[PDB]
Amino acid sequence: QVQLVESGGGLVQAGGSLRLSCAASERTFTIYAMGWFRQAPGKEREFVAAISRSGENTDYADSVKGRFTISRDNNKNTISLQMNSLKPEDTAVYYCAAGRAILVHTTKKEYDHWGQGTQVTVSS
């Protein structure tokens, strides 16, 4: 079983950037496809971005395409979310997620493991 730890959230002004990171358990790191989701006030959780086991393939929600970039470090057992041109509607708890994938280049939308979250608040 895998554990997941998000970091890097905080309070930022609209137009700013933030970089989130997610640490995942070392011994199983590369068995899991990984992703980011977020849950804004009053809303269901929303898929944000996904990355394959290999780190070579990615997928994004239309709401963040071009502003957010997901990356993976298979040296250090992390994934990252670079968030640029932030807007108030990006305010949410951001969750890292993991799920087994048979192939190394597959991205997932459904995940069975997720972190406690990191809070992101974008003010104007």
Numbering used by the authors: 2 to 125
From the article:
The point of convergence is the cleavage of the 186 kDa complement component 3 (C3) generating the C3b fragment (178 kDa) which becomes covalently associated with the activator surface. The C3bBb complex is the AP C3 convertase, which catalyzes further C3 cleavage. In contrast, properdin (FP) is a direct positive regulator of the AP and stabilizes the convertase by associating with C3b in the convertase and proconvertase, reviewed. FP oligomerizes prior to secretion, and in plasma it is found in a mass distribution with roughly 25% tetramers, 50% trimers and 25% dimers.
We then fitted the relevant parts of the FPc structure into the electron densities of both C3bBb-SCIN complexes and the structure of hFPNb1 determined at 1.3 Å resolution into the hFPNb1-FPcΔ3-C3bBb-SCIN complex. The epitope of the hFPNb1 nanobody appears be located within residues 267–281 at the end of FP TSR4 located close to TSR5 and the TB domain, and all three complementarity determining regions (CDRs) seem to contribute to the paratope. One proof of the reliability of our convertase-FP structures was obtained when we mutated three residues in the hFPNb1 CDR3 predicted from the hFPNb1-FPcΔ3-C3bBb-SCIN structure to be important for FP recognition. Affinity measurements for the FP-hFPNb1 interaction performed with bio-layer interferometry (BLI) demonstrated that hFPNb1 had been placed in an overall correct position in the electron density at 6.2 Å resolution.
